[PDB]
């Protein structure tokens, strides 16, 4: 959740309908948009941010909602336009091969800047003490992780969470709607829409 990938999409035709084809028990909460009107507006670049946050912290992944995971790992301003999907994958992620495969951070010297990654290496500092790169009192690794055993409750299973950002800058006609066809019939006087002409 502290080191999240950011994929940059290019000119294409995004079909926002396969999002609800995966395994059940998945959220589709949007902010500022709607899935019914998703394929109506035009966006230049869409960014996908994948992270493995789980538990009762998906509700606080929203503009103006702090918490314990969206406080020093991911911050969203009050302008987010996208839909978050948090389907649960408790079949290929939770395994006994390794419990520290995923990571998780904690409090820092300051709050994270919205939409900024905080890949660090340095050890945490309590404010007044010599660390010297050792694991002692008041100097410990803030990357406190958790285990993933295939016996936990519903509130601790691996949740694959990915958010989508919708930007709108001075750009040409980029991704906007999958398509729209109506099985053209040629027998009478009827309306037509040939890619703009109405």
């Amino acid at each position, epitope marked *: 959740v502290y*080191a999240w990938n950011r994929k940059r999409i290019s000119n294409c035709v995004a079909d926002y309908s396969v999002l609800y084809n995966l395994a059940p028990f998945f959220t589709f909460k949007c902010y500022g948009v709607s899935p019914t009107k998703l394929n109506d507006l035009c966006f230049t670049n869409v960014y996908a941010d994948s992270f493995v946050i789980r538990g009762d912290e998906v509700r606080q992944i929203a503009p103006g909602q702090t918490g314990n995971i969206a406080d020093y790992n991911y911050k969203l301003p009050d302008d987010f336009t996208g839909c978050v999907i948090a389907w649960n994958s408790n079949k290929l992620d939770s395994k006994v091969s390794g419990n520290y495969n995923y990571l998780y951070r904690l409090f820092r010297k300051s709050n994270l800047k919205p939409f900024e990654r905080d890949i660090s290496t340095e050890i945490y500092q309590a404010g007044n003490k010599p660390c*010297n*790169g050792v694991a002692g009192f008041n100097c410990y690794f803030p990357l406190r992780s958790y285990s993933f055993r295939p016996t936990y409750g519903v509130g601790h299973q691996p949740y694959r969470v990915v958010v989508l950002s919708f930007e709108l800058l001075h750009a040409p006609a980029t991704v906007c709607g999958p398509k729209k066809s109506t099985n053209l019939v040629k027998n009478k006087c009827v309306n037509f829409n040939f890619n703009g002409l109405k």
Partner: antibody
Amino acid sequence: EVQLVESGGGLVQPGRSLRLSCAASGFTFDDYAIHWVRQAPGKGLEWVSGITWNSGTIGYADSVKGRFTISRDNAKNSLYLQMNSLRAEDTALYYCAKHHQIAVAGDAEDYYFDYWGQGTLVTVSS
Amino acid sequence: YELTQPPSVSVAPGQTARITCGGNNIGSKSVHWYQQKPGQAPVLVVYDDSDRPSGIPERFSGSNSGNTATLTISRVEAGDEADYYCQVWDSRSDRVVFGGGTKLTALG
């Protein structure tokens, strides 16, 4: 073509920490997995960790869990590996190996290295 | 997993060599090989026991049958003396299991 230059490495006291880097050049740092593998002098190699094309950890060894943390930075095209609580059995040539396949979405997990580098001698003693 | 390799295999430069890597039930998972010149960086050799990368001649070959993967190198020369390793995935433990490489030395 591919130039996997590796930076970071030297003499450090047992129990300290350091940051290793591997700046990629020649290919696209968004579709090829890069791993970390050490090689003790004249005592074979040993896989440390690795990350896929996206930000994803593929696991560690049976002796580096909890102490090592690998991170990927697609913006600067460089792979980083954090080492905590180094001991006497961590003196080896840590390499920066890439992957041949493009790691398509629907396949089977099978990673094999194709491009190798030179490595940095990370010696840990008093 | 745990792979077992011969500590050293020598052969005259007139015939082929026999480098094997055996395990417990390694009959379906892919078997990859590597060659590392002494001092230089490890180079890639025939992988998946069914194809070779670009640049490797036809002399290098591989084959797996049940619990033994044989890296059959043909017409071994002096410039082929290197440390050969075999790779496996072992998705059961989410690791990359290597093994003690074999020091191929052209005798004679």
